């Protein structure tokens, strides 16, 4: 059973699931919007927003933690430089998901996940 | 929750001394037999602590008569009359389960300063 559990397997092992989500977050931060399946994006809004609320405060320890979590110095620098002050006045909810039809390749529910301040 | 963590706090004892795993602890337990009740003492090294408010407990192990004895005293149980600390030990971990492997001059702990 699954009483009061959390975390979607997405038919992948832990290493595969984390390595995919790392690149997903690294592309989402650098493009401010991406398109992916809704179940796979519902975990992005749980794996990226804590990173944003961590980058809200600039510190050596926080920056090294972000580097250990994302494995991209450019991504960490862009996070801390831009998304910190931009979302510093907002208490959560840094991502928005909008469903757009279904993919023709697999007939999968797909959505654009973006930042609240894309424009 | 406003009912649980209001009933589980009305009968808590606000006198538990601060202690850490690896510190020798003496516990006074009420033992009742017949018509009267005495206060027995159990002195040993604390190896594990599980604190959840009223559901708090701690495990104490002592080498008594050559055979190790481990008890699990509930922190807020009325039988546990008093808790005292007689020594302090410097241990990296918080769960001392490797002590069950060593005997003699190998299961002993260093002294924690200050």
């Amino acid at each position: 059973m699954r009483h009061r559990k959390s975390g979607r397997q997405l038919n992948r092992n832990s290493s595969h699931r984390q390595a995919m989500f790392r690149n997903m977050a690294g592309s989402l931060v650098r493009h401010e919007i991406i398109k992916t399946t809704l179940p796979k994006a519902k975990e992005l809004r749980r794996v990226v927003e804590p990173l944003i609320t961590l980058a809200k405060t600039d510190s050596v320890a926080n920056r090294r933690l972000a580097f250990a979590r994302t494995r991209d110095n450019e991504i960490v620098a862009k996070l801390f430089n831009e998304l910190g002050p931009r979302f510093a006045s907002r208490a959560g909810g840094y991502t928005r998901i909008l469903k757009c039809g279904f993919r023709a390749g697999d007939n999968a529910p797909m959505a654009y996940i973006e930042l609240v301040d894309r424009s | 929750s406003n009912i649980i963590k209001q009933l589980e706090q009305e009968q808590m004892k606000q006198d538990v001394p601060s202690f850490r795993p690896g510190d020798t602890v003496e516990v006074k337990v009420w033992v009742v037999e017949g018509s009267k009740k005495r206060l027995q003492a159990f002195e040993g090294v604390v190896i594990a602590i599980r604190n959840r408010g009223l559901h708090s407990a701690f495990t104490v192990r002592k080498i008594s008569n050559g055979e190790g004895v481990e008890r699990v005293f509930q922190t807020h149980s009325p039988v546990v009359d008093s808790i005292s600390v007689k020594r302090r030990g410097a241990v990296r971990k918080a769960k001392l389960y490797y002590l069950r492997e060593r005997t003699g001059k190998a299961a002993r702990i260093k002294e924690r300063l200050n």
């Binding site: 909008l98 469903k99 757009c100 039809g101 654009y112 973006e114 424009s119 | -």
Partner: protein, 56 residues
């Protein structure tokens, strides 16, 4: 594991009596786009509840 008597076309039809497809109950129309879109989804242009969300 296998059949002993060949079934009817009636049995096949009664088995297929439940796999019939269904359509959308009622398509929604955007407030300031005038086009029909699936409910709680965005339009093919990029509009959703008035304000456009995907400007190309």
């Amino acid at each position: 594991a296998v059949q002993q008597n060949k079934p009817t076309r009636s049995k096949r039809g009664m088995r297929r009596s439940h796999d019939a497809l269904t359509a959308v109950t009622s398509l929604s129309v955007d407030k300031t786009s005038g086009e029909k879109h699936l409910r709680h989804h965005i339009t093919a242009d990029g509009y959703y509840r008035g304000r456009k969300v995907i400007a190309k």
